[PDB]
Design a binder for this molecule. Structure first.
Ligand SMILES: *[C@@H]1O[C@H](CO)[C@@H](O)[C@H](O)[C@H]1NC(C)=O
Ligand SMILES: *[C@@H]1O[C@H](CO)[C@@H](O)[C@H](O)[C@H]1NC(C)=O
Lengths: 236, 236
């Protein structure tokens, strides 16, 4: 059955040699490894994706803005990760980090981003709809570390810590470039998948969002904040 | 068995969901369709491909030149075809047709190639090593139309004509945009596969070169000339 479980934003078909199941990335057309997480850049491209022939639809405008200014259509290198320079505009350019947020001040078409700066620490701040009381910190740590271990296939050594107090929860992810091995999922990719699941727009095939139950009681998260820390501080 | 019969310039491995076979294009990392022909642009990216870590290998000198002046690493749009504007890396840019050869005078980074011009007529001019006599026009016509029908998976109507005289053979392919349907292989891609099989660098898995036998008598080709005709004439 032609599926891409880890990335639903794909188009597959049994149009392969001997009925083989080919599958490609929505929008970008890039190759997708459906066993593991797809890089955040290709998923962003698939998010915008500019439908091929609207026919009866209407486009977005030259002046129509969206809620999130950090939403755009990036250019992804032949490995899947972002390119160091993202010029989605007429002549306006800038430099981005691994997770795809802006690292410099907007320049022109003569800009030159040398290296793709690595976002090595990520802090995910969640706040859940207040239940009658608070949970136990141990169960929350167990559930969240298990989530990144199994669901997003992030190695347990990359979950630096989990902090809990009244409603507001925090999750630390620490992945240096020196401690990233062959075929390891990126904490940026895992954080993107986790924010999409938390916000009910999961990239997996079967699911629709995130269940996130802690010892029988569910956990519905109102507010989410995600901070990205780069090895080289951005130059503003 | 993880194999791509139509594109040998790919990297497959059974690391797909439940041991599924995923394959991706060399050099570009783009998704490939291994049942049919891959676009000439992705194969052009694969041809040069700048090996990932030379270690003991090298990079060709910045003053070193190659036999063909029209070989370069192109930018391929999401669908696989060439981007209308090609800039190898520098402040020199130009516009191309669908087959990738140049159309306009070399300019600068402000160039605006408004549309991707189609190549609608392709003429292949072969000259074979002289045997004791010539062949029959009928057998040559049948064999070449059969080769483009079965092997390159080109619909028979797109092979406009076949001409024969003393050694020199000609093949005329004709394909407008109006007569290209859903999932029709392009005359550019079929011609590129033909010219890689003619020169002994076949893009198929099992084969290495073109057998090209006409009623038994093997046909070895010395010289090949392939002319590309664009719907809009190239402006120089
Ligand atoms: C480029 O960014 C602008 C915001 O400055 C946005 O309106 C537009 O949709 C983006 N387009 C692409 C192709 O990323
Ligand atoms: C263009 O790319 C080709 C790739 O083979 C390379 O050999 C050539 O030197 C490049 N030329 C320029 C001007 O960048």
């Amino acid at each position: 059955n032609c599926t891409c479980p880890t990335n639903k934003m794909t188009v597959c078909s049994p149009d392969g040699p001997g009925g083989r199941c080919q599958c490609r990335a929505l929008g970008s057309g890039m190759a997708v490894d459906c066993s593991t997480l797809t890089s955040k850049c290709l998923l962003l491209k698939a998010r915008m994706s500019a439908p091929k022939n609207a026919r009866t639809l209407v486009r977005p405008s030259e002046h129509a803005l969206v809620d999130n200014d950090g939403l755009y259509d990036p250019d992804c290198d032949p490995e899947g990760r972002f390119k160091a320079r993202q010029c989605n505009q007429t002549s306006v350019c800038w430099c981005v980090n691994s997770v795809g947020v802006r690292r410099t001040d907007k320049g022109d078409l003569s800009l030159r981003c040398d290296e793709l700066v690595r976002t090595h620490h990520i802090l995910i701040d969640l706040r859940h709809r207040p239940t009658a009381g608070a949970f136990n910190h141990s169960d929350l740590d167990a559930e969240l570390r298990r989530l990144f271990r199994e669901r997003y296939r992030l190695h347990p050594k990359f979950v630096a810590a989990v902090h809990y107090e009244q409603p507001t929860i925090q999750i630390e992810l620490r992945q240096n470039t020196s401690q990233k091995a062959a075929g390891d999922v990126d904490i940026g990719d895992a954080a993107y998948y986790f924010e999409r699941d938390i916000k009910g727009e999961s990239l997996f095939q079967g699911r629709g969002g995130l269940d996130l139950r802690v010892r029988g009681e569910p956990l519905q998260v109102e507010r989410t904040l995600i901070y990205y820390l780069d090895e080289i501080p951005p130059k503003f």
